Structure formats: structure tokens, C-alpha cells
């Protein structure tokens, strides 16, 4: 179902806060983003690791140089956080992802995994910034 | 869901300062910041 899948989808507007929050390699690793390839076609790639680009690009008022190790089944390459689409998982893209995962041999993540993963986002949103994260943030 | 927006005294940047939080601008770290104007109805006579 592409509806439950949209609960583990990180729109560009929300991640602007998490661009600097630590534990980043632990919350996003397991979510699915709608990255752009390019004409209006899209592929559901998998957030595997947290990489950094040498290209510092301004993402609205905030600015970022980090990359994202995304991969659509077998085709993996570097990606920047500007090309991700706020569009939800459509049906044709959902089936295309299903065919890219059944063609690669990767197991489909069990629904219970998604249900336990979506709450990580809301608990990270409501995290009290009481520790020394503000100082590393400002640096 | 109102996070209590403050205005950095130096940067003039808006800052969200909920309870139990240190006052620092997340841009500068500056320690002085001012509340933004009210949202209520401010009406004057021009008297």
C-alpha cells in the first residue's frame, strides 16, 4: 500500500530542522524518500547511509552540503537533499519500487518495521534540546 | 502548537524558545532576544 509507505516519507520542508540534529544516521536510515531523477518520473530510493558532498548548496534560507546515499534496488549513486520531492508515493511509483526490489532480491521491509519506524520521527520531533546540541548546532 | 517565537537581539532572527530552554540565538548564540508583537487586535483612535 503506498499510503502506509508515505508515513515513512521525509518531505524537504521538515528535514530542514534535522539537517543539523545529531543521531541523523539512526532516524533517517530506514525511511524512504522521493528523490528526483528526470521527465516527471520518480523512483523510490532507500536511505542507506549518511554521506557528505563537497558542494555547498543553499536550500532556501538554510544551506547544506551533505549528500544522501540513496539506492533504487541496484542503481546506487550520490544524491543531494535538494532534489527530493514533497510528492507522496503514487501508485505507479509504488509498483515500480516493488518491481525494482523484487528484481534485485532485496526483501520487502515488513509492515511492522514501518510502523515501529514512523514513530521514531515523531519522537525525534518532540525531543527536548536540553543537552549541548545547540552549541554544535551553532558551530 | 505555538512554540513561542523570539527575535534575536543581534541577528534579528526569529528563535523558538519553549520552556526549560536556555536563551541563545541558534544563529549567533547571542543571549538577548525580544518577544514579537502581539496577535490581538491593536486599534487606536488617532486622537
Amino acid at each position: 500500500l503506498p499510503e502506509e509507505l508515505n508515513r515513512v516519507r521525509l518531505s524537504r520542508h521538515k528535514l530542514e530542522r534535522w539537517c543539523h540534529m545529531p543521531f541523523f544516521a539512526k532516524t533517517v536510515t530506514g525511511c524512504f524518500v522521493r528523490i528526483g531523477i528526470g521527465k516527471p518520473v520518480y523512483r523510490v530510493a532507500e536511505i542507506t547511509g549518511v554521506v557528505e558532498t563537497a558542494k555547498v548548496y543553499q536550500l532556501g534560507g538554510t544551506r547544506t552540503n551533505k549528500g544522501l546515499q540513496l539506492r533504487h534496488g541496484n542503481d546506487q549513486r550520490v544524491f543531494r537533499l535538494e532534489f527530493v520531492s514533497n510528492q507522496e508515493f503514487t501508485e505507479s511509483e509504488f509498483m515500480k519500487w516493488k518491481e525494482a526490489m523484487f528484481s534485485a532480491g532485496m526483501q520487502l521491509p515488513t509492515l511492522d518495521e514501518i510502523n515501529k519506524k514512523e514513530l521514531s520521527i515523531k519522537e525525534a520531533l518532540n525531543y527536548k534540546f536540553n543537552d549541548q546540541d545547540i552549541e554544535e548546532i551553532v558551530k | 502548537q505555538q512554540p513561542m517565537i523570539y527575535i534575536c537581539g543581534e541577528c534579528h532572527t526569529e528563535n523558538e524558545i519553549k520552556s526549560r530552554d536556555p536563551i541563545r540565538c541558534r544563529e549567533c548564540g547571542y543571549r538577548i532576544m525580544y518577544k514579537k508583537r502581539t496577535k490581538r487586535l491593536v486599534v487606536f483612535d488617532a486622537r
Binding site: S11, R12, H13, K14, I35, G36, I37, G38, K39, G60, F79, R80, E82, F83, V84, S85, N86, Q87, L125 | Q1, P3, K39, R40, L41
Partner: peptide, 25 residues
């Protein structure tokens, strides 16, 4: 009265702001 509707600041994207493509650059 003096109130504000919506009450949901996080993701009112209102589509969006012209998402740039990867294969366009």
C-alpha cells in the same frame, strides 16, 4: 476575539516550490 487557525506549522507546503531535478543539471 483573537485566534489563529491551522495550528500545524510543520509541513503546510501548499506542488511546493519547484523541486529541482537531478538529471536536469
Amino acid at each position: 476575539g483573537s485566534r489563529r487557525p491551522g495550528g500545524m506549522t510543520s509541513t503546510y507546503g501548499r506542488y511546493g516550490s519547484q523541486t529541482p531535478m537531478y538529471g536536469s543539471g
